[PDB]
């Protein structure tokens, strides 16, 4: 309703209702060639990335790794209803990494497990 | 933590614990445009016979398709422990095809099956 | 291959008791582990199983609010927690190898190297 | 789940069988099934596995076989040192792994 980043100043748990309105405008002469590569790549790495964390298809995704309380020591009163998602952002640049490496290992060990249990007769 | 085919020479039940390593180095004048569609294309191409065999966001697919003694007669102490992926995509190269139609077509049964299961009022 | 338990009776039941179990021999992380109950007047049952890596773990439904059984890779031991016992859990329990494959392996289910028991008694 | 008579008897030099009875949805459904020899004070060691297999390290006077919902195991050279408590064990599946009947107690005269 507020279209493409209308939302960025909203708190983020408002925020998170224009999931769709973001995705749709992230895919849509030697300049224009490249620049519709570079679109096509980041948001083919982007996907990738969702992909290996099992969150394929979807644009809210739960996870079963925990939350440090180093990352960011706050509750969910004050992350959801009182922050943006820009400043979050900003508060998580650091650790981001590290979210995303135990994400990946998360995930290898969630498809080993169901590899497992579908081969249990 | 091998690196980029690190696991190679790997047997592969060692190997298949580095698939994000191998899957996260596919994606990353008019030479270089050439070059990165044909990365692309190529990355596309293979996720769309994933998604064709209903494999999409898994690594590791377990499928419907019953093994036939005449593409490999070892057993999986011979496949998994004491033979790499090289040797294994060399001994069956000759099947391949065969695989992925028999691929294709028990995820078109499934699709219809699961289709008519969610008909059931 | 040798299996040595280490666990103990129980007085006070409701209580809760740690057992053990280490191996050697054989290479323990490739191997699925399980817990076996023998009573001394009655036959074995099957009480626990837990695959190589140790991310999967069942149970029998009269345990599975009871009894927690984890595996150690690194020292190559077992850990089974039993919590709430009663006089009617009195058995010997045997630490075994096998009860699954990780689906990269030919199947088993069955259990080849047994342990001595644990010889755990409650009053 | 699964029925094992007891007293068994026998001697040496004459076969034995012991048998197992379980039903259509555990013996019928998997090949899984497996037979164990516990001297007393002993360890019950695995004997058979896989209705027809064998482990290493033991003799071959012990066979079995499998047939509609029963299973059986058969001595041919009885020994008098095989006088134990044999259990038939089974795979009964995903929610219920295993199934074990009674103890058959096998004596040699």
């Known amino acids: 309703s507020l279209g493409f980043l209308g939302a960025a100043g909203s708190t983020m748990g408002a925020a998170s209702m224009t999931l769709t309105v973001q995705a749709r405008n992230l895919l849509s002469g030697i300049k224009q060639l490249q620049a519709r590569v570079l679109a096509v790549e980041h948001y083919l790495r982007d996907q990738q990335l969702l992909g290996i964390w099992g969150c394929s298809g979807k644009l809210i995704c739960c996870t079963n790794v925990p939350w440090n309380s180093s990352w960011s020591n706050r509750n969910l009163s004050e992350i959801w209803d009182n922050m943006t998602w820009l400043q979050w952002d900003k508060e998580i640049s650091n650790y981001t990494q590290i979210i995303y490496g135990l994400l990946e290992e998360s995930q290898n060990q969630q498809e080993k497990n169901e590899q497992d249990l579908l081969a249990l007769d | 933590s091998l690196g980029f085919l690190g696991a190679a020479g790997s047997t592969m039940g060692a190997a298949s614990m580095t698939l994000t390593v191998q899957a996260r180095n596919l994606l990353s004048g008019i030479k270089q445009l050439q070059a990165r569609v044909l990365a692309v294309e190529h990355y596309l191409r293979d996720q769309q016979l994933l998604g064709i065999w209903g494999c999409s966001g898994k690594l590791i697919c377990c499928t419907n398709v019953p093994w036939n003694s005449s593409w490999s007669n070892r057993n999986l102490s011979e496949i998994w422990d004491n033979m790499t992926w090289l040797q294994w995509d060399k001994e069956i190269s000759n099947y391949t095809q065969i695989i992925y139609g028999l691929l294709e077509e028990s995820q078109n049964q499934q699709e219809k099956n699961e289709q008519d299961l969610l008909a059931l009022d | 291959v040798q299996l040595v338990e280490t666990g103990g009776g129980l007085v006070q039941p409701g209580g809760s008791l740690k057992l053990s179990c280490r191996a050697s021999?054989?290479?323990?992380?490739?191997?699925?582990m399980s817990w076996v109950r023998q009573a001394p007047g009655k036959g074995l049952e099957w009480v626990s199983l837990?695959?190589?890596?140790?991310?999967?773990?069942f149970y029998v439904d009269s345990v599975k609010g009871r009894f927690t059984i984890s595996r150690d890779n690194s020292k190559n031991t077992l850990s089974l927690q039993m919590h709430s016992l009663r006089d009617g859990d009195t058995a010997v329990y045997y630490c075994?190898?096998?009860?699954?494959?990780?689906?990269?392996?030919?199947?088993?289910?069955?259990?080849?190297?047994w342990g001595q028991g644990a010889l755990v008694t409650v009053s | 789940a699964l029925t094992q008579p007891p007293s068994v008897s026998g001697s040496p030099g004459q076969s034995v069988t012991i048998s197992c009875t379980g039903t259509?949805?555990?013996?019928?459904?998997?090949?899984?099934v497996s037979w164990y020899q516990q001297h007393p004070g002993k360890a019950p060691k695995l004997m058979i596995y896989?209705?027809?297999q064998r482990p290493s390290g033991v003799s071959d006077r012990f066979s079995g076989s499998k047939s509609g919902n029963t299973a059986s195991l058969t001595i041919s050279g009885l020994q008098a040192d095989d006088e134990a408590d044999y259990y038939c064990?089974?795979?009964?599946?995903?929610?219920?792994?295993?199934?074990f009947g009674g103890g058959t107690r096998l004596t040699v005269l």
């Open positions: 064990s089974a795979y009964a599946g995903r929610q219920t792994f295993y199934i």
């Open positions: 075994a190898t096998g009860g699954m494959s990780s689906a990269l392996q030919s199947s088993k289910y069955y259990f080849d190297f």
């Open positions: 021999g054989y290479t323990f992380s490739s191997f699925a």
């Open positions: 837990i695959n190589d890596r140790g991310g999967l773990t």
């Open positions: 896989d209705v027809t």
């Open positions: 259509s949805s555990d013996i019928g459904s998997y090949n899984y």
